[PDB]
Amino acid sequence: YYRFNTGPVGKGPGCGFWAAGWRVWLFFMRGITPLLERWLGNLLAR
Amino acid sequence: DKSKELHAIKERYLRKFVFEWDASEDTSIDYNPLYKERHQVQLLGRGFIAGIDLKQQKREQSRFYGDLMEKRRTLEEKEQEEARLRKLRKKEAKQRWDDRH
Amino acid sequence: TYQRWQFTLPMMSTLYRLANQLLTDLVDDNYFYLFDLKAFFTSKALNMAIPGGPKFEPLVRDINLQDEDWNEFNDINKIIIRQPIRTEYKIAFPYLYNNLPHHVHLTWYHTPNVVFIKTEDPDLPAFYFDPLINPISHREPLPDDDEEFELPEFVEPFLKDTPLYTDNTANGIALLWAPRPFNLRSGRTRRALDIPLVKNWYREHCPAGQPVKVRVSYQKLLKYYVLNALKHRPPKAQKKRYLFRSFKATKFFQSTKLDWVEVGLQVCRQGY
Amino acid sequence: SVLDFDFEKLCSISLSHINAYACLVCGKYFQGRGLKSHAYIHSVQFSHHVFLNLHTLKFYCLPDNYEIIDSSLEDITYVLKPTFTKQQIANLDKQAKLSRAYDGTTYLPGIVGLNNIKANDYANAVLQALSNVPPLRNYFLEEDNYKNIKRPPGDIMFLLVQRFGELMRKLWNPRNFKAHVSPHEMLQAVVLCSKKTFQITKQGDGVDFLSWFLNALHSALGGTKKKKKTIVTDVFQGSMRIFTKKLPHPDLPAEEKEQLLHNDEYQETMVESTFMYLTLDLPTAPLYKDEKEQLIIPQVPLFNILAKFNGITEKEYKTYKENFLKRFQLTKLPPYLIFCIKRFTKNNFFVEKNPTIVNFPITNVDLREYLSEEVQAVHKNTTYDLIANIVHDGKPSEGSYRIHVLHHGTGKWYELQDLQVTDILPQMITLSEAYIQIWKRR
Amino acid sequence: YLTEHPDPNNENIVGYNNKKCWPRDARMRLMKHDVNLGRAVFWDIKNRLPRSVTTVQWENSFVSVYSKDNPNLLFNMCGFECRILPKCRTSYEEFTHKDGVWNLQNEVTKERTAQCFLRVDDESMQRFHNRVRQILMASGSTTFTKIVNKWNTALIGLMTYFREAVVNTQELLDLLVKCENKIQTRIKIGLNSKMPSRFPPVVFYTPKELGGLGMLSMGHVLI
Amino acid sequence: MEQTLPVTVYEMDFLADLMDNSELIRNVTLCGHLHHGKTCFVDCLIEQTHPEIRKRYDQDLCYTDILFTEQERGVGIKSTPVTVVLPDTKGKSYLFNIMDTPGHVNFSDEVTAGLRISDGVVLFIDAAEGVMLNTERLIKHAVQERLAVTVCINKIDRLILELKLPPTDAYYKLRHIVDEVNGLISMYSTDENLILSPLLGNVCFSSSQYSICFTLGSFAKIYADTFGDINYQEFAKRLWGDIYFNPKTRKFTKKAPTSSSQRSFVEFILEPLYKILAQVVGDVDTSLPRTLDELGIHLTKEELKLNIRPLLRLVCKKFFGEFTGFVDMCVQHIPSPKVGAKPKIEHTYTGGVDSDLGEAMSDCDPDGPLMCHTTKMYSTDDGVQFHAFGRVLSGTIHAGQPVKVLGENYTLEDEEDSQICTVGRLWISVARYHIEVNRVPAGNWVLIEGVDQPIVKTATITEPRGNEEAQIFRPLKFNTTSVIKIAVEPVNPSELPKMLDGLRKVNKSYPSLTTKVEESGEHVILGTGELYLDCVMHDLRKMYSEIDIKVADPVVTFCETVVETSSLKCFAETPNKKNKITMIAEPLEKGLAEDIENEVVQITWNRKKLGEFFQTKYDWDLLAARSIWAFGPDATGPNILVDDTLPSEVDKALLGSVKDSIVQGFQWGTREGPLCDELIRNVKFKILDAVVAQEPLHRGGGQIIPTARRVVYSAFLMATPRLMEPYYFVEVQAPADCVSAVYTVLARRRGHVTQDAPIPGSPLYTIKAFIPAIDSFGFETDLRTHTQGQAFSLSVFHHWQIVPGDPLDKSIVIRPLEPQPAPHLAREFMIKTRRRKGLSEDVSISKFFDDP
RNA sequence: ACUCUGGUUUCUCUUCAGAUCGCAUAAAUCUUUCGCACUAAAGAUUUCCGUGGAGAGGAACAACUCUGAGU
Ligand SMILES: O=P(O)(O)O[C@H]1[C@@H](OP(=O)(O)O)[C@@H](OP(=O)(O)O)[C@@H](OP(=O)(O)O)[C@@H](OP(=O)(O)O)[C@H]1OP(=O)(O)O
């Protein structure tokens, strides 16, 4: 934001740059995928 | 700041889901003038920090190298730069005229 | 498979021009003096924080300076003080300004200043005396001219026909000093996840005029970057088993081609 | 009074081993002898005008720089570099007259206390035990016996040998300036050679240190190769026959248990090897005190712990998921026998020191019954006399080490603990918890 | 001492006991000569005593040297950590009247010559803290009156013994205010499980004859 | 011998055969400024001579700089010797001993160690930065050591790919660099025979990054190979120096035709290089094959797919080939050990060439008396044992041979500093591997083993039972002075001996390091800077002694002086109450101490010439010019001892009996000094009167030496004493904008900026400054951090300047921990140092007198 | 200057892989450390995100540019 909102652009809800957060949440999903899979396998066994 | 400095000399020789960080976690609270106001990079007057608006960077730059060119450039070089700036400003003005509220 | 790419230099020049907003146009690592990964590791191992750098919990237990019992070594009546020994001094020379340098990485010293002169006017010749360059103030056992040295007609300059510069010469010389994704001309495709578009933004120093919250955001981003780079272990050898290939090999799965929005809606419905 | 030659021979100013000169007025080591050396400057500065070359053993007056020739100074050199003639070495053990130090402190050579640098009493006890052993001490009292043996270029183990010999010559010096010897150089060599094991600050096990020291002396005295017969092996090493009998798992049927007896794997084997010391295992503490009037302290005879090596006694040995029955039979008795009584044992939670008292005689022990009949004929002598007894006192953590040494020539027994030398009665030695023992075969 | 116990490495400083309660400039400064002298004095004293009769351990003893290198003379006596600083030695400042400081003067001339800064030994502070802990745990079903009486007796003994040293010792004052807050807390929790925010102090400090607990105070309490 | 060695173009037997012939050996030191490409050049040579060793596409492989600290820092720290066999232009293989020295100024001492055992110097100069501080210092040191000098103008590609200069402007930049080097040489050398110019072949143009190494002869030979009919030597003569080419007449003339044609260098050398580089970097995919075909270079498809930098390196390796220009430059101009032996003996050997053994060594014959001379001490990987590295000047060293090693104090009259040692092994020292050999003939470098015990810094290896008149070589005279003083102690005193051992080892590893113990039992290390001491302490902590070590903050070693004569004639008697000596002290004239230090005057000269010099240059009286006794504490010491005793009052013959004792006392007193036990500098001591006892036993020895020191101290104290701070010279290579900011930094550290001239042909400026050494700690870090890393500075010792305050001012009050103001800084610098040394609290003017 | 291999693309299997296996970066468990552990460090293991190398198999269209060899 503080790089996007320099010059003519001021504070506002118009800044779209979602690479960083999308990366972070995908990296979290990578870590938590095996845990949820193991939980589902335990909960759906037999 | 001097009391911060002398203090520095002495010191060396003697739940809650918090979404936003606390301001006490800040660093770079210096007392040395050489470290508080750090001389930014002027990449020969032609390099700019990423992300920031190019026009803002051009306006707020130190303008040292502009003086250096206006002192060293020959008359022909001055004419060349003036013509290039004329064309670039013409294109920028055309873009601004196209992009109006 | 879209795994390897090779580009011609004009394409890479156009790409570098189109991505100039996301690059700081630095031509050296001298900008990262006492502010790079090794400097951060040295700061962390010494339980000290660089002003622009992050702050960590102590690597080892630290004994209060009021616990030492005034030895002859640390007698303050003998110590001459001229300037306060800053944290930067100790990080720059960890083995000189620290009494217990442990797990400290020696920071890379000065690199030669890249003096690459960036060209602004395309009409100018590629090899041109830019005004940035300081003009050189002009002012030999030469052989006598009367001697009979003759050059055969077969002899001429090695590339006399070759022009000194071409329209896309300054572009290549600029590409020499481009950031890493643009220094190359051939490379290996990366995941969209694996490309941090803004990693170099917080790897550099915070801009001088910024509020307190964004400075702390920069510091914490640096902290997590350092933690990732330090807790990193090389990947362990596997047997290369692919889950989706196994899924396709069974009867329960079938392949097709679908719009991303359609599969998003279908995944939402299946999760519900 | 200030001439202490027990430490490193380096210049106090320049840290240089080259041309180290000891100043005989203040005892400080400086460098050089010429006009612009530290020793010359010190001589003209502090007015000390007498110096001794630490390597040439020659005295000089530096401001005029001329040699000093006087026999009255000879004793000083003898303190710096003690030299034992062969007749002196032979007559060493037959010495009854007390020796006077420079100060009025009579002492018996060999019976000399070792300074306790922080917590190194275990090392002092072990070194005193290895000293007072006639053959090993005689071997190390002559520098020529080990100086000429070859060493590898990047070898540090030999620092253990020479310094140890040096230590001996300091201990058995008939004329010494003080009645005590600093083991600092020897302990520094031990720390350097052991790779930060057996430190001077933190005390270690006497048995472990003795084992490591004997092994290191044996290895270092083998020049650029494994000399099968060193002085350490010639003196302390003996040959013992291990009868290892593998055992079936106890959780098996009796029929399968006897069927495994025909496997030819669970029978006695021939793993005869060489023992440098005998590890005697005390029986466990009796827990509840006996109803008799006797003390709560258990008492076990020496022959009872010396029963695992009789030949028929079968002590169980159980590693992970395997059982054994290690029968032991001595085949060659070394001239000097080493017993390493096992006191400290690690239980499930801490380390317990066994308080069992070993009832042993100190003048006659016959081991003829622990040797095979074909072996008994080889050794004419099996009567052992206890000569050294390392005893550990106190808790396993904050323990202290003392030693009972038998001074030959006389018959007196002396207890040494650091700088404390007491005259112990011969009867009282058996009462203390013996840890390590050195016996002479005669 | 060095003839009998040589120290080529100047290792005599590694185990030297010093009074960590005082600040670094107030403790003993481990000069080489001072450390050697202290070790020599202790060694001579130990040699004067046969070991079987009694033993004088170095770890349980403390030797403090005052010389041209050390201005402070420290000693622990009867629970009091005393530090004498001579007037003509490292004072260079006007002095006011502080409770924890004793103004020592020569009898024959009635001239102030040294200041004896007093403190409470950390051993005594630990004994007081343990006494408070024992009072708290041994409370159980006992009446609040007896708990407050025990706390009052402990406080009276501590203050009547360490009168000036309590004022001098800031760590002790913090310990007393913490223990007082604990005692009141105990009473409060007894009154009710829920934490009584802004509980009235009047119930605690009111004398027993008037119905209160009769609790003495050593902290700053604003009614 | 026979052992495993890496694959190389030549054969080890050929390398051993070249060693026997001393006419085909070149002892070369590659010196220069920091990061000017010396190590990369050596790496290029190694790649040329080792097919299996290849430089990484991304990381510039460094065959030298093998230390872990060198790899991490990226800065060369220790000299690396490399012995190779390099082909010449004609194809004749020469044996090359190259001592890659560090470029950093703090490690200049290392270069000195590489200059004693070398006959030639190759100075590497950046084509962009040009001549820097270390280049000037190394030029002065090399031409003062009587060494042949050649220049390699490295990183010419920066003129093409960084500055993008026009080819004529690049030629102008190179010519300016050459002219500046020539001016420096002429300024530091009276003789004008060694003019450096690429026409003579003294200058080679190189780019070690892209392996572009060529001289005029080599590139003319390239022309000869592509066009056979041309003779390369005459063409190379015509290629440089504003000589234009006429293609109508095919002739070279000093007159420029068409008024637009470029020089021969620009037309034939620079322009083709620009075209090659521009085609590779700009027109690779579209127009690289045509230019590659025109040059005869054929590249595979996999080779053409490389990135631009590897492709440039490959193309220029294929074009220029081997570094034959460097070999020419070092063969034609750098003497062989046979040729260059005589200057080396005349300069370094103490006995001189006139001695019989000097004449023996002048021949450099393998079958002579052994006179090896080692100046380096290389530690093994384990760090326990050291190998003494040096050249063999005469005879032949054999493995397993008894040897007499002479130390720095060995003399004929006093031979005690000599030890008989058995050489263990001999290695020819390549960078990352060592070739074990049975013997090494004269004129070659060798790593002697087993002789490290009796030597700390410098050795003189000779053979025992012979050379009874053999003397030592002069100890290494160092470019700078070690000033930065740090106290070192162990964390746990129980492991004090280990650190002590470590100290010895570092004393062997660093030629200029000085480790001692002061009166207070404080271990003292002297270094040349903060990076130097950082490397020293890293070695002391990790390589030699693995113990934790506490390091005090860095302080400088001050000097002592006087500013005006003694108030009264001071005097002292011996403890015998006889032999009264009466002296006064006065300051020396301006520059006299500099003359003494720089060997402009020597006490070894006869009385006539010394008196004439002191009478003409400084206008001394004839009696005053002939009565001079000694120069300061050491040889050529900054102080002067004179006797003004008229012969009528004092017998000169009697005074000469105690002359040696008085001179010894003078030297000791000047070495120690009474203010804070520091060197007395720039003080003239005059012996006004001297009573001498007639009997020999009541004088001499311990009577007159302490008396002389006492009277020297009294004369120094009564004269107004002052302290000298060491002032460093700092050169900052900073961008044009940052220059102002630089001043700001030097504003806070008492820094005086002398000049801020720009770099011709470069967009940077060289800000020169004179900063106090005591204030220089962290100045480099402060400057680089304040300017975002764009400004870099190198500080080297320059001179001694009087501290503003007055040391003998008891009225000054100094708080224990406060930066004192200037007007009494000396008062702070005297007492605190007095506390660090362990002396008394303060010194009184009448302390050494006799009345009190 | 004339002949003969080695082709490229894609799918799958197996194995090695301390290589920045990855110019990116997660999760869990245990131990340790001082606080009193999302807001914390250290050590270790493991699982996921997905690679490189080699080999084998399948099928798609190219067959002598290059690497060379045989001349
Ligand atoms: O949380 P911050 O980064 O400080 O940003 C918050 C706010 O965020 P919340 O809605 O989460 O409170 C807005 O950010 P967005 O919602 O747009 O992401 C807003 O941003 P805009 O003004 O750009 O719309 C503004 O950020 P800023 O004022 O820094 O631009 C504001 O900050 P404050 O909380 O400091 O007012």
Numbering used by the authors:
A (entry chain A): 613 to 658
B (entry chain G): 242 to 255, 270 to 356
C (entry chain A): 224 to 362, 369 to 501
D (entry chain U): 114 to 201, 203 to 556
E (entry chain A): 1113 to 1335
F (entry chain C): 105 to 956
Sentences reproduced from the published study:
To that end, we first determined the three-dimensional (3D) structure of a human CE pre-B complex (previously denoted the 37S exon complex) assembled in HeLa nuclear extract on a MINX exon-containing RNA that was previously shown to undergo exon definition. Single-particle cryo-electron microscopy (cryo-EM) followed by 3D reconstructions of the purified CE pre-B complexes revealed that one of the major dimer classes comprised two similar units (protomers) aligned in an antiparallel manner, whereby each of the protomers resembles a CI pre-B complex. We next determined the structure of individual CE pre-B protomers at 3.5 Å resolution at their tri-snRNP core. For example, in both types of pre-B complexes, PRP8 has an open conformation and the BRR2 helicase domain is located close to the PRP8 reverse transcriptase-like (RT) domain (PRP8RT). Moreover, the BRR2 helicase domain has not yet translocated to the PRP8 endonuclease-like (En) domain (PRP8En) nor docked with its U4 snRNA substrate. Furthermore, U4/U6 stem III and the so-called U4 snRNA quasi-pseudoknot are present.
Here cryo-electron microscopy analyses of human CE pre-B complex and B-like complexes reveal extensive structural similarities with their CI counterparts. The results indicate that the CE and CI spliceosome assembly pathways converge already at the pre-B stage. Add-back experiments using purified CE pre-B complexes, coupled with cryo-electron microscopy, elucidate the order of the extensive remodelling events that accompany the formation of B complexes and B-like complexes. The molecular triggers and roles of B-specific proteins in these rearrangements are also identified.
